[PDB]
């Protein structure tokens, strides 16, 4: 049996074995053609049926290596799995026709097995296209930065499937935006793309994001700016001034229509003006309460209610106080709905009450309400982790085979071109059914499962996680979007069906979520994703912050130090930790690592066990104290950004656009109007220099007074770091 697939898997950095690269032919260039098999082979060869020609390829074995079967399995982060991956990627054929002619064709393959049988695939179409510069679709953008004679289209017998445009950048600006990005403030020079992708680690070194979006501000050095909003959910690529000095060129996805219509939003004024305009299209911030702005407490081994209340004792008797915490392994693990060893009746997958589970007392949560009551108590809320997806490995007890075969009966899955259920394609819970949030109906129906967790447990939130998963441009969702649409969009509709539950059951809309696409604004917390506990993935993390407040994500935060791998260093514990206390959401967290030693938890008493450093336990004190002191100002700064669309976590363009000097130090920040923070982001570092702009500035730690306009130096003990408060009028 030969599989051949023209799109392939549809990762959206990766070519499946089985597919054609590129995936949307283009005549003149190069053209790839991949094919598997269910046994072994001696030979494989590619029949393509021109008119005037019929030609025959040799296609030659792929070795795994050579192939993106690592890039499958989700990259050099699951090491162990990428590899493996590689060297079972053995069944795929290849050949390639270098120069592609302008001309309709079909194709197939034929194989000849060690046996000594011969295949034959289905026959497929290959409709190769051009870009043109006739008027084939409409660019409907106002402004004076569109290039009127730059709009090319991709077209094909069977239509038009990309555009591409250009608009004009000057010398002295500066381009940021874009969503969350994790390489650089300022992205001029620089080749992207908006996608909705899961980079596990690195994602500055790999220049993706979780929260991508088609929106950029663009800013001179005389404090005017402009910007512009891409008014789609498909895929868009950006050269901003990389391969031509003054031209952004724009390619957008027209996705899965003969004359296209792609309009693009557009405002000028100041930086502030830019924001505000993207922002009541896109969505503005929701008013959440005070206690998100304490100190959040998490991690991933704390899976029975001794592991949990242990951590928050010791909280109590080491004088850190915490007002949020974080439960991941609390489930089940296999339907995300019910406590692990809960009791109770099979329903037919319908949604459960509180009354209907026994809690034994043996259990990992012998009684999880009274867990609940007791941390608010205490002053301390609860959030549970969540995912988009329903398992259905064959392994899985009772409940979550029922719970399955209810949603796949509901209807509310997505499904594919087939009308099947969508089986998710990506490496992290591979094959599980992924729900349709994109209608009301499929949104509460999910959501309903859950309202016991809030209405009977009282629950305060949720961890939103995942929301990636969607791969493939021609899925169907219950909204009428295919794939092309939907699948960035499905991480919005995600985070707003959690808020919804949380709202109907007369609670804020908190969801603590890392995957988004323009309308995440309006919908809840957000935090920077997975890294190493390293000082290049702090640096990154500091960015992913200030270009994501610059893209309306107010309520950013991320896992101080890092999550995954070895506890962080004490020199950046400490560093990470000061940080933290001046970003909008402050919290720790700690990766699974099957509960083995040496202990992996953020704690700040875990951490100073290991690294033989116990004052960072005081270090933790004196800034948690610093957190609450914090406070009243957080909140009122929150208003005011709300009001004036300014972010809470604030890149110095939107204050002082007009001093070309603050581009040269694109890791300051303003928290709220009032504080400049710069964190300390070297090891052995004892002085660090900050650059005040104008204004008359006060040391947060000393009331020691400088001008601005200047570079100033401080020294920088681990219980500083540098902050610097407006001097107001009298
Ligand atoms: O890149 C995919 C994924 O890799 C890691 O998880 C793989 C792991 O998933 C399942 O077990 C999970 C367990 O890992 C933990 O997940 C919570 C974790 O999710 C994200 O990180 C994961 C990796 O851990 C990543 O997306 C998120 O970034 C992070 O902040 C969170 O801590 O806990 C849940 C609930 O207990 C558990 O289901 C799966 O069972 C396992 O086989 C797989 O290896």
Known sequence: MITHRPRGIEHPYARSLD????????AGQSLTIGATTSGPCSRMRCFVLWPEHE?????????????????????????????????????????????????????????????????????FPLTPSHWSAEPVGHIDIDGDRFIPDSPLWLVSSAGTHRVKFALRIEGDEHVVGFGERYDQLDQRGLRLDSVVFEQYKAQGKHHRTYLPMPFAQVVNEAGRAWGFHVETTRRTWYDVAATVSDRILIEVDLGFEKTPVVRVNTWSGSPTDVLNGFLDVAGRPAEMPEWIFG??????????????????????????????????????????????????????????????????????????????????????????????????????????????????????????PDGTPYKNRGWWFPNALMPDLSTEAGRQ????????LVEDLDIDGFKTDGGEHAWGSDLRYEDGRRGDEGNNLYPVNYARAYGDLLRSAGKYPVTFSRSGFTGSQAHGLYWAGAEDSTWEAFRSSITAGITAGACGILYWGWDLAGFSGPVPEAELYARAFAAATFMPIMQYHSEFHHHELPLRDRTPWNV???????????????????????????????????????????????????????????????????????????????????????????????????????????????????????????
């Open 295 to 416: 100190l959040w407490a998490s991690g991933n081994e704390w899976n029975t209610q001794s592991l949990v209340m242990e951590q928050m004792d010791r909280h109590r008797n080491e004088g850190i106080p915490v007002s949020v915490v974080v439960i991941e392994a609390w489930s089940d693990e296999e339907g995300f709905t019910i406590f692990r060893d809960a009791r109770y009746v099979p329903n037919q997958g319908q949604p459960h009450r509180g009354p209907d589970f026994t809690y034994p007392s043996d259990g990992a949560w012998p009684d999880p309400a009274g867990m609940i009551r007791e941390l608010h108590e205490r002053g301390i809320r609860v959030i549970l982790w969540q995912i988009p997806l329903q398992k259905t490995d064959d392994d899985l007890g009772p409940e979550a085979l029922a719970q399955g075969n209810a949603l796949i009966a509901s209807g509310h899955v997505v499904k594919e």
């Open 445 to 452: 129906w999910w959501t309903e499962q859950r309202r016991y």
């Open 55 to 123: 030609q025959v390829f040799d296609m030659s074995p792929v070795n795994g290596t050579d192939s993106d079967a690592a890039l499958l399995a989700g990259g050099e982060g699951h090491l162990a799995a990428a590899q493996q991956a590689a060297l079972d990627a053995d069944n795929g054929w290849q050949t390639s026709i270098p120069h592609l002619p302008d001309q309709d064709a079909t194709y197939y393959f034929e194989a000849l097995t060690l046996d000594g049988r011969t295949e034959t695939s289905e026959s």
């Open 19 to 26: 597919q054609l690269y590129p995936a949307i032919p283009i």
């Open 608 to 730: 100073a066990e290991q690294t033989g450093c116990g004052e960072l336990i005081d270090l933790a004190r004196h800034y948690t104290r610093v957190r609450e002191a914090l406070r009243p100002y957080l909140v009122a700064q929150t208003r005011q950004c709300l009001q004036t669309g300014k972010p809470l976590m604030r890149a110095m363009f939107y204050d002082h656009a007009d001093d070309p000097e603050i581009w040269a130090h694109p890791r300051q920040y303003m928290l709220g109007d009032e504080l400049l923070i710069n964190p300390v982001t070297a090891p052995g570092a004892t002085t660090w220099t900050t650059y005040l702009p104008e204004g008359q500035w006060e040391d947060y730690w000393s009331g020691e007074v400088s001008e601005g306009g200047h570079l100033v130096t401080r020294a920088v003990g681990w219980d500083i770091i540098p902050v610097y408060r407006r001097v107001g009028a009298a």
